[PDB]
Amino acid sequence: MAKEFGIPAAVAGTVLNVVEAGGWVTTIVSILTAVGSGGLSLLAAAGRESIKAYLKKEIKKKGKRAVIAW
């Protein structure tokens, strides 16, 4: 999230913790839109897939720590 979208670690970790805790898509969308261009770019990258499901799969694929770095 940091390297490919410029999203800071504190925001990225919050978002992924919300994902892992089973939080709401609305919460994730609000945080990402509020962080600006980087969050908008991550939302764009998800395509039509729920941003929650997309990040959940990224965590399964790479591990949470690496998703934060990404």
Automatic annotation (TrEMBL):
Domain of life: Bacteria
Protein's UniProt keywords contain Membrane: yes
Primary site of residence: secreted
Keyword Transmembrane helix: yes
Keywords, alphabetical: Antibiotic, Antimicrobial, Bacteriocin, Membrane, Plasmid, Secreted, Transmembrane, Transmembrane helix
Coiled coil: none
TM annotation in the entry: 25-47
Any one GO biological process: defense response to bacterium
Gene Ontology CC entries for this record: extracellular region
Subcellular location: Secreted
Descriptive protein name: AS-48 protein
UniProt source species: Enterococcus faecalis
